[PDB]
Each structure stands twice: as structure tokens, then as C-alpha cells.
Amino acid sequence: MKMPAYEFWFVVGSQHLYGDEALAQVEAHAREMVPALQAAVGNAHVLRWKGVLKDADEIRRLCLEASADDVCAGVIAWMHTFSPAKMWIRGLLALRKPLLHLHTQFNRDIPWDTIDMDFMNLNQSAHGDREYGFIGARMGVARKVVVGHWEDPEVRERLAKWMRTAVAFAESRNLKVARFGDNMREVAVTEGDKVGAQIQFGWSVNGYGIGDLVQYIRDVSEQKVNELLDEYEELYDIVPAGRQEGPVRESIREQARIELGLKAFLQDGNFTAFTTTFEDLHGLKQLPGLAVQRLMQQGYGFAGEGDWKTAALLRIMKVMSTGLQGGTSFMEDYTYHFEKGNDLVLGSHMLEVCPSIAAEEKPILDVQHLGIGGKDDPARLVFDGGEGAAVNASLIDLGHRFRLIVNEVDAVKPEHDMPKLPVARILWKPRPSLRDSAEAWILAGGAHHTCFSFAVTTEQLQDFAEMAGIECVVINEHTSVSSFKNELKWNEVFWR
Amino acid sequence: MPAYEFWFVVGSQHLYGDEALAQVEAHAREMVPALQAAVGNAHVLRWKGVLKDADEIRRLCLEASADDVCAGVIAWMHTFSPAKMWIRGLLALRKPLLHLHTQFNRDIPWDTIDMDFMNLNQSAHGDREYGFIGARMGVARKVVVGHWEDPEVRERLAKWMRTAVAFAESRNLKVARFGDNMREVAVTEGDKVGAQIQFGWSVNGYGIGDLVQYIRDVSEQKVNELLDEYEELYDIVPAGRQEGPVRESIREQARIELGLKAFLQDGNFTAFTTTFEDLHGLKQLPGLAVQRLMQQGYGFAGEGDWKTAALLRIMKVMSTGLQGGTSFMEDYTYHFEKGNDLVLGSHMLEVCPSIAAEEKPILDVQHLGIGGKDDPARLVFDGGEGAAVNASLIDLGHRFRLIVNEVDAVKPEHDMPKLPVARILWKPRPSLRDSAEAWILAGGAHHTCFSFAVTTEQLQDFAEMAGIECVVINEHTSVSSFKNELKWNEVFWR
Amino acid sequence: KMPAYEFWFVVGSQHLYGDEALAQVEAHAREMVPALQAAVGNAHVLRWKGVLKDADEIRRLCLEASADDVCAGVIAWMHTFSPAKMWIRGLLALRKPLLHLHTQFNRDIPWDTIDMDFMNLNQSAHGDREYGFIGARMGVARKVVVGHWEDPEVRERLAKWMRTAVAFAESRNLKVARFGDNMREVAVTEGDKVGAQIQFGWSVNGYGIGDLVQYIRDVSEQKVNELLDEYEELYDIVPASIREQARIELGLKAFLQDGNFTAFTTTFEDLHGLKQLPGLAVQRLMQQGYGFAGEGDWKTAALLRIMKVMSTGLQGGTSFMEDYTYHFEKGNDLVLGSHMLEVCPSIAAEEKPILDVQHLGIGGKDDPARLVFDGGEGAAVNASLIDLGHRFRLIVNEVDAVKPEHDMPKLPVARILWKPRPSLRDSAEAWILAGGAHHTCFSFAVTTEQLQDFAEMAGIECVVINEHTSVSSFKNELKWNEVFWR
């Protein structure tokens, strides 16, 4: 949603072979490129010019400082001239921030008429980037490679997506998840290795008793709550049997108290994701719902049944998208519709699903009965899901490693409204086809719990997997279950 | 603890006719009762017949896998038994296997040995065939070699049966956690599904609120008679012999014991964990309650450590019969002295009185800072002396490792009047510095299971059955060679 | 000429034991650091870098220690229980050597006054085990030193490790200049220079002999005369020229300083421009702490510089070596180490190094001037680093140098005699099996422990051949290591 200032260090590789007139000419070319790259597809993320690097020491220092400086979200290296890779070795080793090797070229076209030797010793990026690329593969460093002219619209989009990803990665690297209660009992995919997750992604995932959150809701001012119900009334379409001071209003007031208690707790521990479990709610009047839905809109990561993995992922996919319109939500594939041309999946968690995936209008604020958790009638936001190309991502623990499964799906506007369904919902046709998406998904072992996002590209999730050093398997338009099983087997071998 | 049998099974073939198979029956039917009497009638040794046919062998192995009462199978090839017959079987066999390489006759009847005797008591090469197929299929098997009357072989069978019963208890071990792991603690954390896959452990999180409910509706009658039992069993500090705020604190532990016992019996839980960071609804951190439940055979560990609580339950059921005693344990402080390098083991409150000296544990109630709660009632006592074993199970991410440290518990020559928690002193083998170094290199937890009763042979045999590395730190351990054993094991177990 | 290096002492704890107890830890550390600084001797330097209770504090500490080129190593000790997840983000980012000091402030248990507050302070015993775990779990390269902080055994290990970690910090920033290529058809001299830079950090760069021939001729004849003057005060030189070596010494010295080189290799198969194969020059430069090896052997040259830096402080002396000849005898079964010319005067006997000038067929150049001297005596170490293609292996053979029985009048080269453990036959067999080079680093001052600790920091197999080595066991260790390290 917001918070810490993140910049990206642009770096250019050269050598002392072509002397100082060439080092000035590359520095000139860079000092022009950087600000155009900034104000065009920037504003949000600062793009620092960290100089032309020729010295082994200079490179190694730069990398160390990039690792030390919390504000450096990533390094964007480009070899304008031939920069010998053995200088980058100790540097690339010590570089703990995500690196993008930008294989570009200052001049779009070749100036056929005037192409002296001095131009071949200056705009030679074509092979200075290849030399660098070799040390990249040799040292097996996880790097994004973007190729093309730097003014190119394709390249500026890839730089912009990559910078949003590397910010999501930096937020991940010190992500703080609070779990209220443990996993839903006997559930396997919601379980995981929390310490192994800190090794891989950095996630501090820490368990609090529900009594620790009750203590926070007991401390919430009735005034701040009352103001919040005012904001509800103005923002959402409360069931008419809920504006008069009824037990229904007091049930919406209780979610307001839970929202401001959660918000208070989360902010007091700098938590950006959390998890509630219905199997442990002792001291809550009702299951956190509208509160959780509002916090997710407010951009917090969340997942039910203690699912820290998909809650973390939700936060990561929310901060992956900040700028773009789409919206990102916690999701559970609940029911299929089988029709020849209209093969739908109805996704809608228990009751906690983020308004960011809602259509042009509505958010209706209902409060029907819930059986799960055995608590008071819990207030919720209900709303039809939007439409358009989307992404359904689960993160799972295979024991020895993590696997990110991503399903490209197309959200679809509901042709029929469903009056008795007292939870927000969204329909989607999964690529390549319901039958083959679900087959491949089950084969990959994807969780029941997913992160549904319009805004997050697949490229975005694959980049984040490359940085974080996990398999990222995708099931989309081109996915053949036959080939996909083989790709699962060969990845398993690669990643262990 | 359900009633557990071992299936004694003798391999042979049809080759030497049927009279020879009748003679093998004759030998077995003599051995199996004598073997029962040797190991004690605690764990039953069923005679499950002579297996010749590949179908018969498969059927036996399938039955032993399906039957929850079959804790283990003891195979012994009397005659050459062609191992391909056992293949289909060994794959389907899900219970621990002991390959008993024995022989009926102690000595060679030099005067009367004939072709008939040679194709009867040919177990010397019959087992070696069965040995091959074992190696070939990588089956988890205990190999016991010796005459079936040798005391060493009967000791190894008895211990192996206790371990195979402990493995059967592990395999459907239910653990209840009351609250999550101590926040920011790493070795406490683990893969609970990876555990269920390796060990079978049903490890499940319960809100503390679920437990307060059980305490809130516990009969005050039972509480008063239990507190009456406390005064009998323990030497209550005098301020707790009269009705005061002290003896009420002791009553509140007794409430926590009875509620816990109720909650654990209701869910067939054999082990459980607390955490001091989630007690909302408990008046005080379970102490005397947990200590007493631990004595009563329940597996326990604090700070949400299901791995050590499971290990404690398994390590207790490994001892059932023996009177040694097993406890949850933390290595708290060292004493450095040229000839008297000691380690003081304790917990916040929770250490089983089954390791206590024969002195009657003092039932005290001092202040405890941690968890920030009421003055908790706890048993205080000095640990016994003798050879003992400190075991920690850890998750390395991909797989588990059982670190065992042989130690020698020692009686404190200097009593400790102002330590309000029970404690035990031990000299760890081979020395404090070497043990500690080797332990830290192996990544062993602060939290351990201390047992007088459990052998290293039992924990190695358990790790064999569960298919986890078991690394041992004892007299023989050198830190040089230990670091290489860790390296070379890592590669094998990946 | 040695850059200053410090070690960042850090104590683990948590907030859990209130805030008074964190003052008690502060007090304990502030006492232990000075007494440990004085115990290891004002030579290493040992900063107290504060008590760590937060994950974000621990990450900060690691990141500064990696960034700061002055931090040679970090010494972590958990005074109380320090929940190990807080160290994870930090230990991932820590690129400097870690020693996990598993100690305790109190030697004895105060049996009388052991309150709950005491147990909530002197945890170490289980606070360190938690830390140990996360170390084993992340597979971080860590030394574990256990025992009380007043133990001589602990303070000795701390010193030894600190020496090792400074040599390692000098390895990571090591620059080697090669004056010509390897000996054409030689195998054990060739290796992966990029693989070396990735494993150790060695910027090993080839120069032409023409570059050094340009540098040699531009030396002041005034400094040459002054260097000749120093020779006949330091060595009992034969009557006499030698100025060629003194010229080459100052021309190399100029080249090495100007490129910040601490190690270099010459080859005798490329000397187009040099009047004679550098001998006395290189022997002087090695004595001055430069890493060297002949026949373009950068691996041994790096290993020599690393083992010189590992020894600095002790008066042992480290040299370049080639196992030249054996002597077979009932008991006195010994080896004669030497090289063409290039042996370090730091391994000499009673001093009085002769400065002869005989002919050297090998170079095909002018009879070169050299230092000749008998090798000292005492327990020593013979280390070669080899490339197996996919990784490096440090082979270390413990030897006992022994002072020569007879004289060697006709031998125009510096030499040393040693009995290899556990015997010549076995030590050699183990050596050929481990594929050790002809070229070694012989040191009196370097311990096997040092080389094992260095290998653990550098992430390479370190195979050891000592008294306890058995050739059967050894072969098994080679196979099993092979599987672990690849």
C-alpha cells in the first residue's frame, strides 16, 4: 500500500582500456538515460545513478553498500563497454539485493556513415553484456535479463514491472506475519517450515494467542469505532435492516472494534500480514470478517486457518501491484459450474475476501449466520468479483524446498446474481481449461488457498521466484498436462 | 498403552521334504516359549508358523502390517529360505523387522552330523541369503546374531521389542499443542507434516481457551482429594500445609493437572506442549501439573516444542518395564572444575519427578517471572546418578536428525537451597567441552529428553525404524571424526 | 605493511529476562572483551560491538561487518537464550568468518546463591545450543570453541582462529601477478582462475615478462648500491655481478607495490628480457612477506602469501617448497625439500646464509645469484592446494624437520630435511592418492588446525596427513569427502 522509500541503483560497466574521454562519453550516455527512465515509468520508485564502474574494488564496494543500505531494493547493471567479469566476481558474490542485467544500447540505429573505431570501443554493449552474462551463469546468480533499446516501450514496461517486483521482494525479505492461533487442525498444505521460510524469503512468522488480540480489542475507543461505522455507512451499502440501532448494527460495530484492535496490534508490531483461525477464537464475539476484508483492502496480507504462506504471498502480491488498478485478494476455489462454453469456478473464502477485486459498484455490508467457529452472526462485505485477465498463485512447502504455482485465469462477470449466497464471490474460467487447469494444479499440489490478482503479471511472480530461489511453475493458455507432468519431474530434480 | 505382540517367523523351503519342516516346527515351538520367558511376559511373542511359500510369506507380512497389535516381526531362516519368496512380503511389511541370525543347537554334534543335520541347521547361510535381500531392498532391519539362549541375544531382543513398541506408539502418537512456538525460536520450529510422514505424529494446535474450558468445569471434589494425594506423595513447604494463598496456588496447579488429564484423555493425546507466551485464562504456568503428567507417562516440552514432547513420549514408552525414568530437559548452567566439570539440567518448572533421587520431592511455590503470572506450584528435587542419555530431535529442513549424548548423572555434593526448580547434574561424555562442541556442531536443541532407562542402542534402533540419521556423542566421540561423520551422513540421508 | 584488522565481539540475548539482566550481560561482556584482548595479546584487536536482542539489530551488525573491510571475523556468544530466528536474516548476509564462542561468565556454580534470576542470565549452555542449531540448519561456515573465557585452551584457539581469519581476509582481497604462463605441459599448475576468485577471492592476473623487463631497467642504481650494501651485512656472501638479483628484487618490488600485489609467480620457460632467473631477489621478496611459486604456480603462490599472513606474529617462517630427493635409512628415513633457487630464508638454521652463484641449466640464462642455507628443525606443516576441476582440495602433511647430519658442499641450493608423518612410505602414498602437487608451502609456524579452519572459511575440502593417518582410512575419507564436496 505505502511505507518505506525504495530506490534502484543503475550501474554501467566499462574499463580503463579506452581511457577517460570514453569513460566521460559512457558517463554522459548514462546520465541522459537515467532521468528519462525515471520520469517515464517512474515517479513512484527512485532510480539512483551509482556511476560507471571500471575498478574491481569500486564494483565490490558498490555491491557491499547496496547490500548494507536497506533502501536499495535492487541493482540495474548495464555493460556499455566491455567490462571484464573477473572484477564483478567478489562484488556479485557480496550483492544481497536483486540484480537486473539490462542488456541495452545507447544508440537505437548504427550511424552507417561515421562509425570510427572510437564508436566500436564505446557502444560495444552487444558483447560486454555477453561477457558479464557468462559470469552470471558461471556463478549461477539469480538475475533478470532485459534486452533491447532503453527508450523501447517493451523495455521500460519490463523495468517498471521488475522494480515493483524487487520492492515486493525487499518487503518480503523483512516481512512480519502475526498468526492469531495455529493452523486449522489436520490440514497439510496450510502447514509448513516457518524457519525454512525465513531462510528462503526472510518472513518473520510468529504466533500470538487470540487472548493477545482480545486484549487489543478491549482497549479500542468506542469513539474511533463510532467514527468507523460512520465511514462504513458512507462507503458500503449496509442491508437496510442494519442502519437503525439493532443487534445487526451492534454486530457491525463488533467488526469495527475487531478492525481497530487488529489494526492497533498489527501497527504496534509492524506486521504487514496476519492469519486468523476459526478453531481458536476465545474472546472474539465473532469471526474476524469485515475487519479482515477492510484490512486486506487497506493492503495487509491475510489468510484463514493459520495459512501464513498464502497470507505472506498476499502482502507480496499487494505490494507487487501498488500503482496498477487490478486489485489482489485471498481466494479459495469453492464450487465448479460445468457448461459447454461457460466452464466457471466460483471462488469466495469462508467470508474474508478483499474488496479490491469487486466490480464498479456495491460493496453490500450483510450479516447472515455462520456455523464455522461457533460464534455470533459475523458482519461481512458481499460483492460480485470484477472481470478480466487475472492470476491465481499458491505457495506450498514440499519439505526440502518451496514451489510457487501460478494459474492465469480470466475473471467473468456473473450473468446470474445469487441472492442466498451471503459472502463475496468471483467467477473465472481457468486457462487453459477448467479440466486441465485443475488436473495440473492437483499434480503440482497447489493449496486450496490462493492469491487472486488482476494487477500481478505472471512475469512478476516468475521474477520474484527467480530472486527468492524457488521453482515457479505456471499453468496457462499453453499448458499441456502431458508436458506439465514432465516439467514437474525435471524441476523437482533441478531444485533439490 | 495397547497390548502389543511380536510375530516370530521361521523361513524354510520344501526342498528337504516335510519331516525336516516338522523338525523346524519342533525347534521353533521350543524356542518361542523360552524366548517369551527370557524377555518377560510384558510384550507377547506370538509363534506365526514356518514360512516356505512366497504366497504364505506375503500373507504373513500383509497381516502384520494390517494388525495394529503387531508391534514388530522377528524373522529367522532356520534352513536356506530363497529370498525372492520374501521380496513381495518385505515390500508390504510396514512393521519393524528383526532378522534374528541364530541356530537351535549351541554346539556341532561332531559324532552324528550327517547330510540330514546339514540341510536342517543351515541357518548360518539361510540368514545370509535373507541378509542379502535386506541389503538389496534397503529394509530398516535390526540384525541380532548369536545363539537364541545367549543372554546378549535375549537382552537385544528385549530392548528391540521395547523400541519396536515405542515405534508403534510413535506411529499413531497424537500431540496437542496449547499455543504456538516461543516467538523467534528456531530449533523449536519444524515441519509438522514432514513429521507425520516420517514418524506418523498427529501434531495439532489447540487454543489455550479450549483448555481453560476443561479447567473451568473440573470437579472441586476430585481437586481436593488430589491435593490430599499431593500432601501424601510430596513434602509440601510448611506455608502450604495450612490453607493460605500458597496452598491455593498448589490447588490451582491440581486444577490444571485434572483439566489437562481430562483434555488429553478426551483426544487420546499421549504428548502435549505449553508455551509461557500464551496463558490467557490460566492463573499460572502449568508446573506441578505438567511434572506429574510427565511422571504419568505423558510426553511434554515447553515453549511449543512438539518435537521434544513427542520424543519424550517415545523415550518413556521405550523404558516401560525398566524403572530408570525419563524427563524433559534444558542444559541450563555449566560448572567448570579441573576434575568436576558439571552441567545443571532444569526447566522453568517442568522436569519429570521419575529422574528424582529417593528423597521425596519438595512441593514448593516460589515466584516465576517468565509468562508474568501467579506464583506457580512446582516439585523441586535433585536428579539421581548413573549412566543416562540426552536426546534431541531437530529438523534440518529436508530431514530430521536424532542427536544422542551419553552422559553420567551425578548426585550434588553441595545442596542448592535457593534454586526453586528441580535440577539434575551430569558429566556429559566424553567431556563437557567436547560434548558441547559436538552437540553445537550437530545442531542439537537446548530442549532434550533426559532418560536413565533408554539405551543409545534403543534410540539408534528407533532411528533405524523411522529412517532418520542418528548421531551419537559418547566416550568414543572425537570432535575431528564427528564433524566428518556429520558431513558424510548429510550426503547419505539427502 | 599489514592492513589493520579487528574482530567484532558480539553477545546474544533477548528482552525476555527483563531489562536489568541486559545491563548484567553488558557488564559481563565489557569485562570479558578487555581481558580477552589482553589474553590474545594487543596484536589481533578485538572490538566489543554490543549486545544483540533484536533481529533488526543482528541484521545491521552482520551487514556492517560484511561492508567494513577492516572486520576480519566476528565472535558470537549467547550469554542468555537469544531466539535463533532473529539471527537468520543476519547470518545469511554475514560474509565474514564466524567463531561461535560457547562460554560462560561464572567458572563455578554459586551453589548457595543460585536464584531464578541467576538461571535467567547464565543460559549460554542452552542459548548457544539454539544458536548452534540455526548454524547447522543454515550450513554456515562456523568455528565452535567451547570452555570458560579464562581457559588458556580457549584463548589459544581464539588467537589461532584470529590469525587464520586475518589470513582469510587477506585471501579474499589477494591479488596475484603471473610473469608468464605455466610450464607448458604441466597439469597441477593449471586451474580455474575464475573458480579460485569465486572460492577464495584471488584476482590472479597474467602479465608479460616484457612488463617486468620495462620495470627492472627503470630502477635507481643508487638503491641497487644501497641494497648490495645491505646484502654483505645480512649474508656472508662469497668474494664478489650479484647486482642483477638486487636490480630484479627492486624492479619486482616496484611492480608488486604499484599493482597492490601480495603474491606473484615467475616461470623459467619465459625469461625473454631477464638476464637470469630471479633467485636471491624472490627469496628476499618472500622473506618480506610476498607469496611466490615458480613455474607460474599461482595456487602455491596464493597459498604461500595466505600461510605467511597466517603465521605473522610467531617466529616460525613459511617457505615455498618442492620435495626433491629421499634418503632411505633404518630409522633416519628423511626427505630433502628445495627449489631451483627460490627458498625463503625464514626457514634457515643458525643464520649465516651463504650467497653463492653457481650455474643453473634449467633457465638457459646467466648463472643466477641465490641464498643457500640449511633448513631449520622442529614440527612443521607441508601444504599444497590442488584443483580437481570442479573444486579445490587443501592437502596438509605434518612433518618433523630435522637438522642435517652430513654437510652438502656441492649442493648450490637452499634445502631443508624433514621426516614426514606417519612415515615417508605412508605420507607419500597418502600424498599421491590425494593428488598433492610437487610444489608445497612448508611452514614451522602454521598449525594444521589453522589450515583446516581456513578451508572451513573458504568452503574447500582440507585433507590432513599426520601421525594418526592410515592409508586405508585416508582412501575412504577421500572418496566420502569427494561425494560431500561436489
Ligand SMILES: [Mn+2]
Ligand atoms: Mn480456507
Ligand SMILES: [Mn+2]
Ligand atoms: Mn525451554
Ligand SMILES: [Mn+2]
Ligand atoms: Mn618447481
